[PDB]
């Protein structure tokens, strides 16, 4: 019943960046990423591969698992919302290092190459594309708050918090605003790492959720709510 | 109750990880990997692209950690590319690290079963159909197939029925691995999906459809 637009050809949606604050977007903060490097050549510290070394540092090797961040990044990066260009990722290392992840990046699927990329990133403070046109991974200045959109809602994943429906939550929120999730990549710990920034903490379920599952479960809600498909 | 292949009446979500690239090679037997063994597989004549058991580990991790597994409504079957079919007990907690996953798989393939004190991981005789529920619908993940809402799909199906999803863990290949058993192929999302995301993509809707929460 309606004449088609001037140009129907699908065009790639804009790649969201920290500079742009107006657009509604999805922000996921993989807070408390356990990413540490040490000269043996520098290697990303691992719970299993390195046990004696971290004992010498005096850090509990239970909190020495970067693969949890890898899987969360993998499931998060490959989500269709990222393909729609409506999601942009931040990582807050346990040390206090904030890493900005450009949505365009394609991290390696295997962990070994993933570790090689972290050590390069942490030492060089930035990662350049193969074509050398953009910095996919870049370390940025804390706090996270300045980078976040001017109008935005902040929430954390809390097991003890009331269980909510992700789809109903996103619908009732306004449109011009954005939503931030602060996910705890730690294996086991108290959920107060983002208390200072967040205003209210939400639980996605009653039963415990893995970090990757919660990220995957949450983003499906936005895609259904936003009709990303 | 823990779901098992013996029980067929109960409605459940079956996920078949077809084209799983799990293989043990002895120089001691170790799971072949794309990165760990590059020169050896070059000698074998097989391309290193299709030598990635990481994908199956990722798909198993999301599936087993998925809600519906916690609610006792999911069972996983893995069909190795060599022709080995593996049943996964829903109660298992597979190693989260890949290196320990590889060591578990080599134990499974050689010992044919894992016992810790009902086999957690058990190799069982093909075909898949005899193990599957008597009344059950079969579908595959096809990018070319029409895009269907996973939620709306599940409600319009019956209640006594169960649903089987055949996901290809292969890095690259034609989506005809399960054409012989499946009756129709469907598309889950409009964009291309990895096997892990598709499993995560699918399971969330059944949780919504069946109100697993």
């Amino acid at each position: 019943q309606k004449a088609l637009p001037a140009s129907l050809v699908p065009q790639a949606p804009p790649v969201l960046t920290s500079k742009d604050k107006i657009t509604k977007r999805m922000i996921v903060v993989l807070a408390m990423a356990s990413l540490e490097t040490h000269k043996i050549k520098y290697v990303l510290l691992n719970c299993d591969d390195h046990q004696g070394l971290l004992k010498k540092m005096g850090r509990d090797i239970s909190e020495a698992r970067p693969d949890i961040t890898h899987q969360c990044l993998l499931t998060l990066l490959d989500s269709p919302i990222n393909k729609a260009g409506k999601l942009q990722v931040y990582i807050q290392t346990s040390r206090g290092i904030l890493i900005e992840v450009n949505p365009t990046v394609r991290i390696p699927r295997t962990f070994k190459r993933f570790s090689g990329l972290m050590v390069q990133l942490l030492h060089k403070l930035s990662i350049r594309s193969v074509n050398s046109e953009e910095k996919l991974l870049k370390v940025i200045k804390n706090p996270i708050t300045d980078h976040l959109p001017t109008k935005c809602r902040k929430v954390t994943l809390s097991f003890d918090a009331p269980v909510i429906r992700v789809q109903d939550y996103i619908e009732k929120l306004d449109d011009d605003e954005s939503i931030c999730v602060f996910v705890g990549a730690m294996a086991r710990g108290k959920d107060n790492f983002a208390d200072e920034y967040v205003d209210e903490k939400v639980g996605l379920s009653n039963y415990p959720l893995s970090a990757s599952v919660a990220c995957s479960k949450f983003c499906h809600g936005a895609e259904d709510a936003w009709n990303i498909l | 109750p823990v779901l098992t292949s013996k029980d067929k009446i109960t409605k459940r979500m079956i996920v078949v990880l077809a084209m799983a690239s799990l293989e043990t090679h002895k120089i001691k037997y170790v799971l072949l990997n794309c990165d760990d063994h590059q020169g050896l597989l070059k000698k074998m004549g097989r391309d290193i692209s299709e030598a990635r058991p990481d994908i199956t580990h990722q798909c198993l991790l999301t599936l087993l950690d998925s809600p519906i597994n916690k609610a006792g409504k999911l069972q996983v079957y893995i069909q190795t590319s060599r022709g080995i079919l593996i049943e996964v007990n829903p109660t298992v907690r597979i190693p989260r690290t890949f290196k320990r996953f590889s060591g578990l798989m080599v134990q499974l393939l050689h010992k044919l079963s894992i016992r810790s004190v009902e086999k957690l991981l058990k190799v069982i005789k093909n075909p898949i159909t005899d193990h599957l529920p008597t009344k059950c619908r079969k579908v595959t993940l096809s990018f070319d197939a029409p895009v269907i809402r996973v939620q709306d799909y599940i409600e319009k199906l019956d209640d006594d029925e169960s649903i089987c999803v055949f996901v290809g863990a292969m890095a690259r290949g034609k989506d005809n691995f399960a054409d012989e058993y499946v009756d129709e192929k469907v598309g889950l999302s409009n964009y291309p999906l990895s096997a892990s995301v598709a499993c995560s993509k699918f399971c969330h809707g059944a949780e919504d459809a069946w109100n697993i929460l």
Binding site: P108, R113 | R52, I55, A171, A195
Partner: peptide, 11 residues
């Protein structure tokens, strides 16, 4: 163009 579960090239 990378798609699906393809991994980045190894050199």
């Amino acid at each position: 163009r990378f798609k699906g579960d393809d991994d980045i090239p190894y050199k």
